Amino acid sequence: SLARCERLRGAALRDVLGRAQGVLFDCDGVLWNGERAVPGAPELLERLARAGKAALFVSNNSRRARPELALRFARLGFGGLRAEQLFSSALCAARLLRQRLPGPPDAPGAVFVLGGEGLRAELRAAGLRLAGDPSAGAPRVRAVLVGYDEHFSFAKLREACAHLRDPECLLVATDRDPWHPLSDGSRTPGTGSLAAAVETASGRQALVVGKPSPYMFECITENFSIDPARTLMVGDRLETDILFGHRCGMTTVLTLTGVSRLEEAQAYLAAGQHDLVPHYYVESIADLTEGL
Amino acid sequence: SLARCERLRGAALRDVLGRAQGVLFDCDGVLWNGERAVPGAPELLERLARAGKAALFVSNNSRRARPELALRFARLGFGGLRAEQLFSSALCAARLLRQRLPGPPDAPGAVFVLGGEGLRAELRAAGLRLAGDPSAGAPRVRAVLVGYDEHFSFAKLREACAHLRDPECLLVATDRDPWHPLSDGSRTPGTGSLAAAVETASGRQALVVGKPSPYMFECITENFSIDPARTLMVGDRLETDILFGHRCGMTTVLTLTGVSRLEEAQAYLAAGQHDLVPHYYVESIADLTEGL
Ligand code: NA
Ligand code: NA
């Protein structure tokens, strides 16, 4: 494998960025951490545009529908982004459920959602009928969707299992991220931990929407012409972003501003686990800018 | 391996029961299902006693402290049992935490419990200090215990992770049973599904108290002289009871009144997974009685 976790700098940086037609970024851990933008990040995005290179964003975060996700970007200092550049697991879960939900067109099945109002909004926008929405003048639940659910409960887990007793009922998860570090130094459980409970209790394996599934790259290509061979994938999490990159055939860049540490990358290398090793790393994405 | 999933009947039955000094039973799925005793079960227990063979009971169910567990037995038609014959994951979790909790004798650490009042009662009876109990005139949490928690929540999961940020804080689970079938034909999530969430979110592997750990057999032997070579283990769940039996060196009998199906036993056999194959099976434990 060519992925040898090289520090991207100098001539190599200019040639890599030179060749690249476009760059896909995760957001948390890459552009910002909590409320603080990574210094130089907004400038890198400006420079990319002015070099005529495309930028798209690919987040496993299922908490916000696209419009509030756009706000999130703008709030943290990232200007004239178009909402169409932003892809989340919530958006891509809605797409998938539209594509896959079984049953007739003619009364549709409902989705039982474990997740918050932003995820629910994204689903309704795709035309999906949700369990627990107002009933007509109770639809069959045809999918269970496990999202980031800060109100997860035993009762909700039990109801999910009830729906999943029907083998035709889909089980979908927005992502399998196990936990996330917060700016106050603590951690919050991630969707992967909730998916673990639901899969264990139901005996069913979830379809996973988010990275490291290739699915989000399918959603992106639906909308944009991107040649994976000429696209950089830039992320902070090896098991999610870097694995995604390799599965899609992109050149992968680990940034060290987020979850994964350089020594974890180098440990995967030594163990010959090349799918979890980035092609390149940078301390922060501010290091990329001078290559343009 | 000798475990060839033979139907225990006739001469073989008389010689197996003849040799046996004692029999360990699970309760749910074996002695009863929901509110209904297995016909002939109370009689088998009577006959065992009158043949001078010991009977002990070994349940992963962490919902009841021993006294209410004894009630449960009596309610379902099982008479003069002594409470000392009954071993549960709740009882054995309390034991383990007494043995393993780190810190000084002199102010002790507290256990953060995910579980109900019966589990909490069992812990307090062993002299353990629980997080969220009245404070003196907040102790350091030194263990997280994952039990059967019908009030499990995201918030509780998040608090558990906070305690587990300390590598010295133990993570213990009462059992890893993924789900359970109810008498109304539905399923309830099991402790294993909650443990899956806690292990995923914390990145830590739980110490498991219940079957198929050998630990409960250690607790039993603490109190009773039992030769595993001369003890039958009788259970309905291959991955829990039958695996436990093999790990302890007992002769294993699958009863078909519970979770596991005969064809699952025979499938493990064919795949050479001998640790999950019983030595013998019976349709119900009523079939054992005539061997005495
Ligand atoms: Na990230
Ligand atoms: Na059982």
Residues of A labelled catalytic: 26, 28
Technique of determination:
X-ray
What is the DSSP secondary structure assignment for residue B285, as one 8-state letter?
G
> Can you list the domains of chain A with their CATH numbers?
1-88+211-292 (3.40.50.1000), 89-210 (3.40.50.1000)
CB contact under 8 A, A200 and B186: no
Residues of B labelled catalytic: 26, 28
Q: Which residues of A touch B (CB under 8 A)?
A: 149-155, 157-158, 161-162, 165, 178-179, 186-190, 192-194, 196-203
* For the CA of A239, the nearest ligand: 1
User: Looking at beta carbons, which residues of chain B come within 8 Å of A179?
Assistant: 161, 200-203
- Residues of chain A immediately before an interruption (C to N > 2.5 Å): 137
Map residue B22 onto helix, strand or coil.
strand
The phi-psi region of residue B52 (left if phi > 0; otherwise alpha if psi is between -120 and 50; otherwise beta) is: left
CB contact under 8 A, A203 and B178: yes
* A28 annotated to a ligand binding site: yes
Q: Strand order in A141-146's β-sheet?
A: A129-130, A110-114, A141-146, A170-173, A207-208
Contact B23, B53 (CB under 8 A): yes
Pairwise CA distance, residues B66 & B72, whole Å:
10
The rounded Å distance from CA A47 to ligand 1 centre is 22
- Distances from the Cα of B109 to the Cαs of A130, B160, B163, B170, B174, in angstroms? 45, 15, 12, 11, 19
CA distance B168 to chain A (A): 17
* A106 annotated to a ligand binding site: no
The DSSP element (H or E) to which B41 belongs, if any, is helix B41-50
User: Looking at beta carbons, which residues of chain B come within 8 Å of A157?
Assistant: 152, 189, 193
Mention every residue, 6+ apart, whose C-beta is less than 8 A from residue A120.
A113, A130
Resolution (A): 1.7
Residue length of chain A: 292
Mention every residue, 6+ apart, whose C-beta is less than 8 A from residue B217.
B228, B244, B247, B248
Q: Hey, what long-range contacts does B50-55 have (CB within 8 A, 24 or more apart)?
A: B50/B292, B51/B17, B51/B292, B53/B17, B53/B20, B53/B21, B53/B22, B53/B23, B53/B292, B54/B21, B54/B22, B54/B23, B54/B224, B54/B226, B55/B22, B55/B23, B55/B24, B55/B25, B55/B85
Q: Which residues of B touch A (CB under 8 A)?
A: 149-155, 157-158, 161-162, 165, 178-179, 186-190, 192-194, 196-203
Which of A154, A188, A205 to mutate: most B Cβ within 10 Å? A154
CB contact under 8 A, A178 and B186: no
* Closest residue to A154, CB basis, from B152, B165, B200: B152
User: Looking at beta carbons, which residues of chain B come within 8 Å of A164?
Assistant: none
Pairwise CA distance, residues B134 & B145, whole Å:
19
Pairwise CA distance, residues A163 & A111, whole Å:
10
Tokens of B279: 């030595």
Cα B38-B40-B44 angle, rounded to 5 deg: 115
* For the CA of A59, the nearest ligand: 1
Pairwise CA distance, residues B209 & B215, whole Å:
6
Pairwise CA distance, residues A227 & A221, whole Å:
9
Please give the annotated binding residues of B for substrate, written as ranges: 59-61, 180, 211
